[PDB]
Amino acid sequence: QDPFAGDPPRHPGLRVNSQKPFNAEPPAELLAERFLTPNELFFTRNHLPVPAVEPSSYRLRVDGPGGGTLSLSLAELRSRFPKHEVTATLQSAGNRRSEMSRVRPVKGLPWDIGAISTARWGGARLRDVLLHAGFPEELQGEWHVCFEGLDADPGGAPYGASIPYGRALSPAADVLLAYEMNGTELPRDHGFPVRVVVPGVVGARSVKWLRRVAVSPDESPSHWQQNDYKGFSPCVDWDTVDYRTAPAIQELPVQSAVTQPRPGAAVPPGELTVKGYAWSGGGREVVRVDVSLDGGRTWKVARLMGDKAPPGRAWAWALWELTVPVEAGTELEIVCKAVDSSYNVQPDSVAPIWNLRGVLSTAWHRVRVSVQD
């Protein structure tokens, strides 16, 4: 019967948008409590039943340059390659989808602002694993590294995704084959025993339950690389959608949201502490977060907290707070917007960035609250 009966159990407090397959986000109240999202609260995005993997008999398959196959046990992956730790934010393409649906309904999981989490990942460098397999530093022309998961649909197609070969081999890009998450082994929901982590790139490419790495002249031929996770114009309908026309999403644009306080809340007069997160793709650092209480007319600069990465390697979000005076018996529209190190900014409104898939939702986050007497 149930194809999902072997799924792991989860922490009780989550905002679950789908039980089967399991897709949940942490309550926004907890999301920015901590710089590293605890493993139990880390948002979970599963397309399929969670694989049950016996650790000893697991083998990761890596296709070598000549068409032969290298085969790696969990123990080999731990012992043969220097462990590297990378703190990276994973964000779903559809984070903040629900705000986009308010304009015009979209297809997809109705994510609120918490389809984003941060962990310290430990594992083998993908670069080292490929050099070990025999691949050079540089292949000429345009190449991609395909990943397949152990999870498959009833008809047998695995979850798959790819990244450009150059990113796979770059020391600076920090692409990991991770077996470790916030210092413990990878939880089942997060890809036990091995997942790719692609810093600075949409979560879709961080393939969980990794069963194969292949180098190819093209992208992953899988449905989710070729006919999904792509952004379109505000005009594109379902009968006119053309996935050949847009690039697969890799790097994500600058993003931010307010996590404290929550919409509709009553706040005590005097002082309010507004908190949130901000993040940008491509290793671009968040350099500023502006916060408004008057719906986006005046702004003040927030305080930023982060782990100060080297230029071009800002893989982790910035958490932000602003403590500001609030008067008895007023309504506030709390708004936040972030600015990255290439000075990309977030757009004012959602309607002009609307799309049928509900991805890439990065317009200013607005939270309407009231102050008591």
Ligand X SMILES: Nc1nc2c(c(=O)[nH]1)N[C@H]1C(S)=C(S)[C@@H](COP(=O)(O)O)O[C@H]1N2
Ligand Y SMILES: O=S([O-])[O-]
Q: Which is nearer to ligand MOM, 97 or 127 (CB)?
A: 97
Hey, what amino acid is at 52? A
The yes or no reply on residue 202 touching ligand MOM (CB under 6 A) is yes
Q: Nearest CA to 189 among 1, 7, 2?
A: 7
Closer to ligand X by Cβ: residue 115 or 302: 115
Letter string b/e over residues 116-134, b meaning 16 or more CB atoms within 10 A of that residue's CB: bbbbbbbbbbbbbbbebbe
Q: Which amino acid is at 339?
A: V
Between CA 246 and CA 254, with CA 250 as vertex, the angle to 5 degrees is 100
Residue 296 contacts its own copies per CB under 8 A: yes
Of 227, 323, 330, 342, the one binding its own copies by CB under 8 A:
342
| Residue 45: how many other CB atoms lie within 10 Å | 24
**CA separation for the pair 255, 278 (Å, rounded):** 6
Residues 6+ apart with CB under 8 A from 144: 162, 163, 164, 165, 215, 216, 217, 218, 219, 220
Task: Pick what 266 binds: ligand X, ligand Y, its own copies, none; C-beta below 5 to 8 Å, kind-dependent.
Answer: none
Instruction: Build a one-symbol-per-residue string for 126-165: x at contacts with its own copies by CB under 8 A, - elsewhere.
Output: ----------------x---------------------x-
Q: Is 337 in the site for its own copies (CB under 8 A)?
A: yes
| Residue with Cβ nearer ligand X (42 or 279) | 42
Could you tell me if 62 and 72 are in contact, meaning their C-beta atoms sit under 8 angstroms apart?
yes
* CA-CA-CA-CA dihedral for 128, 133, 136, 141, to nearest 10: -110
Cα R_g (the chain), whole angstroms: 21
Burial class of residue 185, CB neighbours in 10 A (0-12, 13-18, 19+):
middle
Check if the beta carbon of residue 203 is closer than 8 Å to that of residue 232.
no
**Which residue's CB comes closest to ligand Y?**
108
> Which residues contribute to the site for ligand X (CB under 6 A)?
42-48, 90, 92, 149, 151, 159, 190, 203-204, 206-209
Candidate list 203, 253, 276, 283; residue touching ligand MOM; CB under 6 A: 203
Per DSSP, the three-state class of 241 is coil
Residues 204-243 touching its own copies, rule: CB under 8 A, are: 231, 233-235
In the list ligand X, ligand Y, its own copies, none, the entry touching 90 (Cβ below 5 to 8 angstroms by class) is ligand X
Q: Does the footprint of its own copies cover residue 308 (CB under 8 A)?
A: no
Given strand 15-18, what is the order of strands in its sheet? Answer: 15-18, 23-25, 44-45
Q: Which stretch binds ligand MOM (CB under 6 A): 3-11, 129-137, 178-186, 196-204?
A: 196-204
214 binds, among its own copies, ligand Y, ligand MOM, none (CB under 5 to 8 A by kind): none
Among 7, 28, 39, 45, binds ligand MOM (CB under 6 A): 45
For residue 311, state whether it binds its own copies (rule: CB under 8 A).
Answer: yes
Q: Which is nearer to ligand X, 47 or 96 (CB)?
A: 47
Work out what residue 349 binds among ligand MOM, ligand X, its own copies, none; the CB cut-off runs from 5 to 8 Å by kind: its own copies
Q: Which residues bind ligand Y (CB under 6 A)?
A: 92-94, 108-109, 359
How far apart (Å, rounded) are the C-alpha atoms in residues 191 and 50?
8
| 295 forms part of the interface with its own copies (CB under 8 A) | no
Nearest residue (CB) to its own copies, 142 versus 153: 142
| In 198-238, beta strands by DSSP E | 210-216
Name the phi and psi angles at 77, rounded to 5: -60, -35
Residue 212 near which of ligand Y, its own copies, ligand X, none (CB within 5-8 Å, type-dependent): none
Helix (H) or strand (E) holding 158: strand 158-164
Considering the rule CB under 8 A, would residue 341 count as an interface residue with its own copies?
A: yes
Is 299 one of the binding residues for its own copies (CB under 8 A)? Answer: yes
Interacting residues with ligand MOM (CB under 6 A) = 45, 92-94, 115, 202-204
Query: Which chain residues interact with its own copies by CB under 8 A?
Result: 142, 164, 166, 231, 233-235, 246-247, 249-254, 281-282, 285, 287-288, 290, 296, 298-301, 310-312, 337, 339, 341-349, 352-353, 360, 362
